[PDB]
Amino acid sequence: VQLSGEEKAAVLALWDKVNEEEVGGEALGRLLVVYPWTQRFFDSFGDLSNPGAVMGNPKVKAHGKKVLHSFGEGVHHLDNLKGTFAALSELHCDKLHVDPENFRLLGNVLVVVLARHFGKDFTPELQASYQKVVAGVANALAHKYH
Amino acid sequence: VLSAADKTNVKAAWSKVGGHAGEYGAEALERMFLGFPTTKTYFPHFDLSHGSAQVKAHGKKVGDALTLAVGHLDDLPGALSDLSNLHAHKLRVDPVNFKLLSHCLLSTLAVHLPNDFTPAVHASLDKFLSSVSTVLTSKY
Numbered sequence: 001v002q003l004s005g006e007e008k009a010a011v012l013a014l015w016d017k018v019n020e021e022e023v024g025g026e027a028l029g030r031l032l033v034v035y036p037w038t039q040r041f042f043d044s045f046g047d048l049s050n051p052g053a054v055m056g057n058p059k060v061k062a063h064g065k066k067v068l069h070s071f072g073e074g075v076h077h078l079d080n081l082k083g084t085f086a087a088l089s090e091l092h093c094d095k096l097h098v099d100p101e102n103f104r105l106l107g108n109v110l111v112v113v114l115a116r117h118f119g120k121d122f123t124p125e126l127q128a129s130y131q132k133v134v135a136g137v138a139n140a141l142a143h144k145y146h
Numbered sequence: 147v148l149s150a151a152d153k154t155n156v157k158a159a160w161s162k163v164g165g166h167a168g169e170y171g172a173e174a175l176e177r178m179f180l181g182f183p184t185t186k187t188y189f190p191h192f193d194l195s196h197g198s199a200q201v202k203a204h205g206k207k208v209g210d211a212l213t214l215a216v217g218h219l220d221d222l223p224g225a226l227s228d229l230s231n232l233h234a235h236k237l238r239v240d241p242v243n244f245k246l247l248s249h250c251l252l253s254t255l256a257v258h259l260p261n262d263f264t265p266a267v268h269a270s271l272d273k274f275l276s277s278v279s280t281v282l283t284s285k286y
């Protein structure tokens with residue numbers, strides 16, 4: 001959201017190196033292994049027993065990719081998040097009934113997987129930034145929860 | 147820390163960490179100050195400058211507080227019941243701030259140990275970091 005040209009440029013340049021399948025299936029997988037209560041929502045997706053099943057499950061990968069693509073749309077509509085997610089919010093509150101906080105969670109999980117993937121170049125400076133983006137997307141996905 | 151399989155990942159994962167505890171202690175703090183700015187008001191007496199021998203000389207203090215707890219998994223209330231009276235009694239630190247340090251410290255470990263920071267262990271550490279957080283916020 002409200003930040004800086006040099007930070008934006010930075011955030012963006014990093015997002016051209018983000019393999020959305022890899023980092024995608026990784027976030028959703030860990031979310032499920034680290035915060036097991038979220039296994040309840042994605043309940044059809046076959047076997048989500050041990051972390052080995054979660055991680056190598058084709059449906060975690062495919063939805064993961066759908067999640068991270070949604071994130072990028074956001075990394076590129078810096079000034080219009082609320083508008084961007086003014087539907088993924090409705091489908092999350094009503095049809096899904098998902099607690100607002102579970103978002104910030106998947107967010108911090110997405111920052112951690114970026115962290116392992118881009119080592120030292122994932123500077124406290126650049127994560128400093130990402131927290132803002134993850135913060136904004138969270139607030140937008142819950143916007144319609146009143 | 148709690149379950150066996152968990153107390154097994156923590157001692158194992160931390161041996162991975164080894165003698166880089168204060169360094170990492172340092173960095174996590176550096177990542178929480180910039181990333182989550184409010185936390186910076188708990189340290190008016192601090193050189194909040196990147197390179198600060200102070201922020202640098204406390205991460206080593208935080209690293210050791212954490213190495214000890216690693217070796218005291220069976221009883222955390224007792225082996226930290228000073229740090230418990232410190233953060234909660236003398237300082238009044240908010241229970242939501244510990245998550246910010248727990249997030250940063252984890253974001254960090256992921257930066258220095260990519261191959262070792264696996265899902266199973268990431269699970270465990272989150273737990274170990276929740277438990278220690280509780281102990282310190284226990285006097286509330």
Ligand code: HEM
Pocket residue numbers: 038041042063066067070071088096098099102103106107137141
């Ligand atoms: C970081 C914020 C999140 C983003 C950006 C995100 C993104 C998405 C996207 C793009 C879809 C696809 C919509 C479609 O198929 O038309 C979706 C669906 C879904 N999301 Fe989210 N999501 C987020 C957080 C969460 C969380 C925390 C949960 C669980 C607690 C969750 C549960 C679901 C479920 C159950 C579906 C339906 C999947 C299906 O069966 O097709 N989402 N989400």
Ligand code: HEM
Pocket residue numbers: 185188189191207208211212229232233237239243244245247248278279
């Ligand atoms: C993983 C959790 C944490 C650990 C292991 C930890 C460790 C420590 C230790 C060992 C000390 C005392 C050093 C001494 O006796 O000289 C200390 C002091 C202190 N801690 Fe933490 N801490 C944690 C969480 C936090 C959080 C979340 C904050 C607030 C954002 C915080 C703020 C402080 C402050 C203000 C002091 C006193 C600083 C001074 O004047 O020296 N701590 N911490």
